Write a protein that binds this DNA or RNA. Structure first.
Lengths: 188, 187
DNA sequence: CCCGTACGTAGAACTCGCCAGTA
DNA sequence: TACTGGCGAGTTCTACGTACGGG
């Protein structure tokens, strides 16, 4: 065989999203990869190691994109747009990462929760750092506002995706940006 | 009397401490100080017990939010009342916030459906208000309603996981001002 | 008449009797 | 005919859902 490890991680990411962590099985993974379960164990000595490798792959996909987006410009409207774009690009291309982060089913194993937390915190840090440097407010309050902003973006994105993309990505982004800028105050 | 109520409280405790999958009927019976057969006499399945706990918590949150939304037609005020109701929920019934938003049994759609309906009732109420008071068409109004509810829940989870570094009144006012004026009014 | 105990069983993460290609 | 190397056919352990001894 060739490097089956890469194809196994791709298949496992596909399978975990459909079944959930607990329901996914090594029998199902071997079945869909068309490889025997002992060979899979030859590559990954435990189910947890495979899970942490998938989680790490998805977090890095999102985080490098977010950092690169946040380094493009010092114009708050611009860094706002770049970050929201990075978020929508992630949720559209890596559907499995999206499901694994927002529909995580194995919180009972702290290494799992830590990978999720570090991924959520990278987003919070990028928004917070810009707001803190460019606002001078209370440190505690700025992080809370950054978290709210990130959460709002993810929830809008989840609405869009769960509705079978009823509007264009450009429309979803523009709506989110306009809402982030003028808030509820400019809706009526 | 009817031990059922105390059992639901104990089951909520066990699910929050251990998580759904790790929780066991043996542990719930142990902490309630009852035998496992009596627990099965009251709740025929772990899923049924979980759904009963979940339903209790959802009704707890949603009635508080809806009643908040009926107090006044000053949209800024109903924004504050609803967010306050949400923070109030997350502070008293600490176990419920975790059970709804840190849900570990995605494999059983009736669970996910009860969660979806709780989020959607709040979203529907906000959407209905935006549509009547803004002339916004459905897609944009619903997207904004979803954004507002998600933002409030995430702010509350940050605040609670950070051990409440500011007062709820402070937490509430900061959240409302950010929701109202957006980033344009942050510096 | 009824609670605490001790168990059957299901399901799945992990391993062992086959099976194909050489001199 | 024998040696390498990967696969169906067990093993066990864990935890849900019930059948013997006290009050």
């Amino acid at each position: 065989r060739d490097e089956r490890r890469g194809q196994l991680l791709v298949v496992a990411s596909d399978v975990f999203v459909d079944r959930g962590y607990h329901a996914a099985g090594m029998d199902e993974i071997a079945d869909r990869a068309g490889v025997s379960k002992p060979v899979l164990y030859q590559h990954f000595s435990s189910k947890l190691e495979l899970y942490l490798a998938v989680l790490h792959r998805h977090v890095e996909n999102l985080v490098s994109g977010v950092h690169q987006a946040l380094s493009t410009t010092t114009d708050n409207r611009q860094r706002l747009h770049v970050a929201v774009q990075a978020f929508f690009d992630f949720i559209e291309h890596d559907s499995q990462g999206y499901r694994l982060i927002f529909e995580n089913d194995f919180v009972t194993e702290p290494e799992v929760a830590a990978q999720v937390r570090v991924a959520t915190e990278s987003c919070i840090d990028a928004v917070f750092a810009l707001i803190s440097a460019d606002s001078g407010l209370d440190p505690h309050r700025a992080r809370m506002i950054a978290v709210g902003l990130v959460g709002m973006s993810v929830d809008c994105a989840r609405y869009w995706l769960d509705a079978d993309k009823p509007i264009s990505k450009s429309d979803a982004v523009e709506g989110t940006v306009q809402f982030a800028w003028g808030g509820l105050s400019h809706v009526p």
